[model samples]
Every structure is written in structure tokens, then in C-alpha cells.
Target: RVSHEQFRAALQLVVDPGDPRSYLDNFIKIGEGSTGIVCIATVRSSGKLVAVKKMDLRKQQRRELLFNEVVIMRDYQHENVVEMYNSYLVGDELWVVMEFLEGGALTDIVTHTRMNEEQIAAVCLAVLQALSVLHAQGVIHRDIKSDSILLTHDGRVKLSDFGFCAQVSKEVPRRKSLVGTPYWMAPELISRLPYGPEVDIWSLGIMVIEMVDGEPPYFNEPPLKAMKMIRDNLPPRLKNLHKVSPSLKGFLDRLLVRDPAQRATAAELLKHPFLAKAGPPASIVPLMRQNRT
Candidate 1:
């Protein structure tokens, strides 16, 4: 167990500082990340539910990786991005509290529910809105997939999981880091070529296919096999091409372009006819309710 003084020192380093409290209760395991366990907990002060991610500092390399996520979560706040409430230190573990969304991650829906074009469009628009904000700030969400997209009970979409994010600046306008899930990685990233935020567009393109087809391209293949498949297939085509509408086809065409230069950006995609005609955020509420049952 860490001393109270040690806890205070660590707590002070958090971007949004909160006084240590014993008010959190009724912890229920909700999710898990690479280095932390996430739980749903209630604040006794108000009975408010929050998602708490706990990381043990004794683990090697967790502290460095945790602070990266902490910094990103603390700084990025948008309607389509998950907001960090605050962080605390208990013993040797760090607890990061964030808004709890009843709808859970889009992964839940993509796996269990077959989304129509309208629902797909709505989700795309919301994620693109988040990407626009992150890109404008020189942040590249290296990972963009259904797992990273969260939802509210009323169907509001939000982007989460910033552990793999990277920042670009004038001194380093492009990144060559080979990060993110292999199935959703952009061609440039797999090719080891320097890339920018356009990689996110490609990942989102893959995610769109996942929503329609139930899984990401090459999802069944090994990571190495998928990387090779991605290399051979410049733009992964939709298996359900016959069933999709022309508007969706056109959107996919722009998003899956081989050249990052030709790929549609988040801002550009927001103006796309498909996304422009997306259903309201509340339209998917019934779907959320159905999943709950």
C-alpha cells in the first residue's frame, strides 16, 4: 500500500485533480483494457454512475501508458468524445473516472444487431465529428474501430480509448508509428509509410464495413495474414455490395481510396451526402433498449 503522501503526490499530477475520497461504491466489472480493469461504480454523494478504470502501478510500463491515456482524456472534451471526470490514487492503483454510457460500445451493437444504412450513417457522423476535433488539434486516433465508439442509451455516439493516440506538429507533420489494431489499420500504416490523420478515415471505412457485414475485413485471419491481405487489397471492398445503397457505395469509395491524399477526411466525410442524411441521434434508442433486454 502506498502512503497517503504518495497518493497525494500522484493525484496532484492528474490533469483534473480531485480530492481523494472513499465515496465510490458498488463496483461492478464492466470492461477491460490492455492494462486496466474497468468497472461501473456509484458515487455515494449523488448515486451517480461512472466508469472507473483502475491500473496497478506495480506493473511494468503501465504508468507510462496510463498517463498517456489520462492526458488525452483530460484534454479532449467534445460531445462525440468521452469526458474524463477525474482521477484518484488508491494504494498503488490509479482510478480514472469517466462518464458512463448505458449503451456501451458500438462493438456490442455491431456484433448483435444488424445496423441499417441510417443507423450506420448516424454512427459515422458522430465518430467523424470526434475525429474532426482530434485532427484539428493535431491528434491522430491511431485506433478507430467499433470497439472505440461508445453510445448512450438515447443513441448519442462518443469515441473512446486514447491509449494508442499520437500527436503531430510542425516539427513532425507525419507519423510512421505502426500502432492500432491490425484488422483496421490503414494501408500506409501497414506499409511503414509516413501517414497523417487520413489513416483514421481508412479505419473508419473498415468500421463502416463491420457495421454492415458483422465483422471487420480479414477479421478471421492472423494479424500477419491480415497485413498481407491489406497490402494486396488496396481498398477492401464490401462483401455486401449488392445490398448497399449507392450513397453508401459512394461514401465507401471516397473513404477506401488507396491514396491517403484521395481519402475523405473527417470534415469532408461529414459533408458527404450519406452522412448529411443520417438519422437523428435518438433514432437508435430502441435498438439500445432491445440490447438491454
Candidate 2:
């Protein structure tokens, strides 16, 4: 474990060039995992709040992944996406700073509290909007899970964590490097086939099912068993969900088709009947507050 003082020193080295003192104070460590540590910091000088991710360079492979993330983030920008504020090398570590969102991840909230149809539609719409932007730029966010969707205090969904993102080169065939959470990966990806933006659509299908059914499409006795089921089994039908509309289920089936070619494009999914009607504004602070319990 990293000491508070050491963590603070590490952050100071990568402070945003425009706001040098941003990490000197007002930062608090919120979460930690095997991959890295997440710190929520307030820029006292500018009154800006942001999240900083710090990774250990001793972890050779993770360090390279972090480096790739910084490279991708430097080139991409979109409203529905989380903005990368700055990044730099601090000693042997790599630190990245980004906008701080108050609400927790979509998965954390949805698992406990059921969302009305309108709310589910609203969340899916926001994510699709982000995917549309990414695909247009020839970028693929390989990892798109409920945990990666951060909710703002005002209820807007911000697609966070681009660590697995890669740009497709038209000059050459898509790379076969498979990188993504297993449960959310497309069938083609699981089979080691070169894939494109459609992988994200498959993840969206999982997200929709998780929201409606309160769990992933496949959940076996163990995590590895669940992964094997995802790879070998056909996606389960939503037979028990009481509030899910037929149109929504149909849309999900189309996107989660076993063949990536048959999956709906991000643009086509946006035009589906389920997303045709405006559900709720992304900025639904009061609703989030009430439903947070």
C-alpha cells in the first residue's frame, strides 16, 4: 500500500500544467484496486474537482496499458466522454487526471435500485451517443461495462476509462489483440477474430440486459463458468422481467446477435423505437438523489 504522503508527492509531480497546485491539497483517496488507485481531488486554486489515476510502473504490462491510455486520451474528446485533463510521468509511475463525477458507477446503482423504463432508456441513449462519437473517430472503446459508466450529480452518464481503447487503421486489417472485460466482449472478440466498433454494441446489449434483469445475461456458479457460458451459450431471453418492453428486448437481441455482422450499428441502435422517445434529461439530480437509496 502507498502511504498518504507518498501518494500526495506522486500526484504533485503530475499536476496539470495549467494548474500546478491542483494536487498539492484538497485531494482524497476514494478507491483502490489491484490495477491502480483512484483519488478524488479538488483544485483549490481553480475550484475544479477531478479524479486522478496512478499506476505502479513496477507492473510492466499495466504500465504499458496506462501509457496506451494516455496516448488515446490525448487524441479523443467528446461531451458524453470523460475528459482527460492532463497526464505525466512521476518517478517510475504514470498519473492521469480527469473530470470528477459525484455519483457512483451505473452498475453500482442499478444493481440495488430498479430503474423505470424511462430511466433505462435515458441511460442507454446517453451511452449510445458517446459510442456514436467514438466510432465516428475510428476509435473503439473495447471495454464498455456498467461499471465504466459514471453518473454525474445531475444524472448525466459520462463514459469513463478508455484504457482499452484503440484506433482502427483502414490501411490494415483490424488488430487481433483482444483486450476487454470478458462478460462484455462480443462473440467475435471471444473467438479471437479481428473486430471493429461492433464489439461495443455487444457490450451495450449486456448493459441493457443488466439494467432490466438486474444481472448479466450469463451468470453461472463461478466467474469462470459464467465466462465460458458467455462464450459458448446463446444469450438468454428476458422472460421474467416485468417492466421491460417488447421493443426494448427486440432491440437488445438484434445488437447482441451471435454474429458481429448482424449486430446493429451504434447509429442504427440510436434510431430504435426504444430510444426514439425522449425519456429523461441526463441532468436528473433530484431523481438520482431520491433513488440513490
Candidate 3:
């Protein structure tokens, strides 16, 4: 667990003038990100909090891959997307300073509470908003699972983790790349077929199950088996779907359609009836209160 003393001790670290970097002692190890370890930190002179990500650079391939993420993050801006404050490449570490959302992750809420269909719609709406923007820019956020969906105190949901992002070339706007978590991955991705932003839609559709059932489809099976099922069979829906509304079921149906062309786009999904009837996501805030998980 991260200690309060570590948070307190960090206040003593001296920051160099004109440097945007947080001091080493200012960090309290928090958790892990896809490309690196993460920590909570503050500026030497303020009570404000920020998340610091330390990307490992022992492998040259990872360094080049994650630098692209850094570049994209520096310019990427959307209310539903995690905001990047700054980034640095110092020796073997790539440090990223980002906004801190105390409300924590949706995964925290999934662990302890039963999310209703309306609540699931609210989360999906926020994520789709972010995806809509990314797709327009031809950037694909391959990892769009429950773990990467973070929440803010005021019911705000942010999509994070661009580590597996891909930039589609204009000449070949859609191509194959086997990336992202097993359960949430699209069949085309596992099959290594040409794909595009539609892959993210498939994962976000899978994410609905994570909200309702506390896990995605095939989550109980081995990862290898899950990959096979995704590659060869139709996508799975929420395990106990009777607990959800038919509107939500219908929405998922349109989203999980095996053909990328048939699956609804983020813009189309935003108009879904399930989201139209859903209340504010703030209602789920208590489930994410500090350390509740």
C-alpha cells in the first residue's frame, strides 16, 4: 500500500527552477500502467496531486513504441480522455505527469457493487465520446477495457492507457495489429484481419459486460482459450443479461455484431436509447470512495 509518510516525505524534495519534473521523493508508488509503474505525487510547493508514470526503457523496442504514446498524449485533448500535464525523457525513464482523479477506477466499483444498466450506459457514453474523437484523428486506442476506465468525483469517466495505440496511415487507413486484453479484443484483431477504430467499439461493447457482470465474456476461461473463442466464435454478451434492460441488450447486440460495418459507430451508439434514459453517472460515486475496494 502507498504510505502517507511517503506522501509527506515527498514534500521535502527540492525541485529545480524552470523544470516541470516532479522530484523523486515526491512520488508515492500507486499502481502499474501498461508501459510502466505509476505513482502519486505533488509539486514541491503545492497540495495539488498528480499521477506520475515511470516507463521502463531497458528494451529499445519498448522505448520507441511508448515514445509514440507520449507524443500523442501531449497533443490529445478531450474531456473524457485523461489529460496529460507533461512528460520527460530522462536517461532510462520516461516520466509522465497527469491529472489525478481521486474517484479511482471503474474496476474498483465493479469489485464491490452491482452496476445497473443505466449506470453502464452512462459509463459507455463517456467512453464513446472519447473514442469518437480518437477515431476522427485516425488514432486507435487498442486497450479499452474496464481497468483503463477511470472515474472522477463528479461522475466523470475518463478513458486512459494509450500504450497500445496505433496511428493509421492515410494510404492504408486500417490494418491488422494483435494488441489489447484477451477477453475484450475483437475477433478480427485475434484473427489478424485488417481492422480500424471498429476494434475499439468491439472492446467497449465487451466492456458493458464488465460493468454488469463484474467481468467480460470468457473471463473465467484460460487466456489462451479465451483468445481462441474470440477468434473462432461469435462474441459473448453479459452472463446474467436478464438483470439488464432490453434496451441495453439491444444496444450491445448492435455493438457486438461480428462485422465491423454492422457494428454501430461511437456517434451512432451515443444516440442509443439506453443512454437516453440513463441518469447521471455521479450516482455511482459512492462506490468509488477512497480505498473502498
Candidate 4:
């Protein structure tokens, strides 16, 4: 067991000099995470709606993880990325105020809508753009499953859930950490092999199927089965991707390639003809809002 002093020291926890709890009010619980409470709150100063994430920093080296996420979200800035207004420490908990994305997570988004290739391309483009920023900064979004992707009211997409994000140094860009969703994880990770940011591309490839078919392959099978498949079986392809252009299919193929060296980087995939040929991303706004729960 980790003592409080040891945990805090390891996490480098520090009280924010500019506490933001004052301007936040009317917290209504909307969802939950592995180590936190997700809610919607209003910003008193600007009458803006924001997402407030309350994470318990009590144990499990969780405070360390959440602290890392807060720092990343605060420092990593991009239009397609979730914006952090403020974060502060209080009573063994870390509270973060972030941009409120009304369109919700892509996990729930798929449950409610059936997306065509163009729509899927739009999503991929948005996520890849955000990921490019991280990659250029030498960070790896170790978790890229649908649950971590958020949608805004205008049908714009953003990546969230930074719990497993790893910052790779210029001297050593490979990350061997075995962290992320089983189904969406890369083969290199399943093999416990050293990997790079391309892991997120593998998850992005799976996300293609998740968007088109409303779920990725092995949606029903147990995690063990999926883990085994990713280890020895062929990479997953979009079986229902009938009539979708060859560009889109080829794009997924490149992203899903089992070898990390063969997988397409986020920037490379962004230039694929699939996204270049897709319609305006905002065209899917109604499709997302209409199916909202």
C-alpha cells in the first residue's frame, strides 16, 4: 500500500495558485469514469456550460495518473482537442473544468447512429488532426477507443480520456506500457513489445468499423478471445464496408497493419484520399444530435 505522503510526492501534487472552484456552479452528474465523476456545470463569470471532472486522488496511484492527465490537457492545446479551463487540488480530489461537448462520447454516438463512409472519414480526420498535435509534441495517446472520443454540437470531434497518455522523449520514442482497451489495442501492445504513437492508429482503424457498423469486430466476444485474436490472428477489417471507396478501404488497411513500422502515422493517414474526398464534416451534425439520448 502506498502512504499518502509517498503518493503525493511521487505524483508531485501541488495546490493550484489560481483556484477555479469559485466560478463553477450547478454541478449535475452526467456520467462516471474509472477513477472520477463526470458532470455538467455552469461558469458563473461567462454563462458557459463546461464539463467538470472530479477525480478521487485517495489511492491506487490514481492521483498520479489524474495529475498527469490534468497537466497534459492544460498544456496540450488544439482546436480538435478538449480544452481545460482550470484544475486544482482539494480534499484528496482533483477537479478539472473542461470544454463541454454536448454531442457526447463516440462510444454512445455509435450506439445511436449508423454512419456512412464520408461521416466516418470526417471523424477520422478530426481525431487524426488532434493526434498529430500530440505526436509532434512527442506524446502518445495510449488509449484511442471510441469511449475516449468526444463530439461537439457542430458535429466536430475531439479526443478525451487522457489517463493512459504517455510522453515519449526524443532519445527514446518507444513505449512498452500495456495499457488501453483490449479490443482497440495494438498487436505490439498485446505482445508486450516496444511501440510508438502508431498504436493509436491501430485503434483508429478499429474505430472505422465501429463507426460504419455501429460497433467494432468482436463486440460480443470475451476480452480473452479478442486479446488472443490481436496476438496471432489477422488484423481486423471492415467487413460491412461494401461500396465504400477503395481509398477508404486502403486507408483502414494501412492503419490496421499489424506491424508498428508498417502502420500509417496520424499525419500520413490525414492526407489519404478518403478524407480529402469526404463531404464537409459538419454535414453529420444533425445525424449526431438527432440520435442523442
The candidate that achieves the highest lDDT relative to the unseen native structure = 1
Query: For model 3, what is the alpha-carbon lDDT of residue 143?
Result: 89
Considering lDDT, which of the candidate structures 1 and 2 is the better prediction for this target? 1
Q: Indicate whether candidate 1 or candidate 3 has the larger TM-score.
A: 1
Per-residue lDDT for 1-293 in model 2, tens only?
Answer: 46544644544443444432435456688887455788887776667778888777666443445545566656667667777878855655567777787876887766776676778878888889989988887788888888889878777778877877777867754757878877777778877888888889988888877787777766535755666777788866675756667877788888788887788898888888988654655534544645555
List of clashing residue pairs for candidate 4: none
Per-candidate TM-score against the hidden true structure:
0.90, 0.85, 0.88, 0.92
Candidate 1's error at 16, in angstroms?
5.0
Error of 1 at 266 (Å): 1.2
For candidate 1, lDDT tens digit of each residue in 58-102? 663424555666888778778888888888766667788889988
lDDT of 3: 0.77
Number of clashing residue pairs in every model? 0, 0, 0, 0
Alpha-carbon local distance difference test for all models: 0.83, 0.73, 0.77, 0.80
Supply the TM-score for candidate 3. Answer: 0.88
Q: Give the lowest summed-lDDT range of ten residues in model 1.
A: 59-68
Report the lDDT of model 1 for residue 23.
74
Best to worst by TM-score, what's the order? 4, 1, 3, 2
Off by over 4 Å in 1: 1-12, 15-21, 58-63, 289-293
Pick the winner on lDDT between candidates 2 and 3.
Answer: 3
List runs of model 4 lying over 4 Å from the truth. 9-15, 59-62, 291-293
The order of the candidates by lDDT, greatest first, is 1, 4, 3, 2
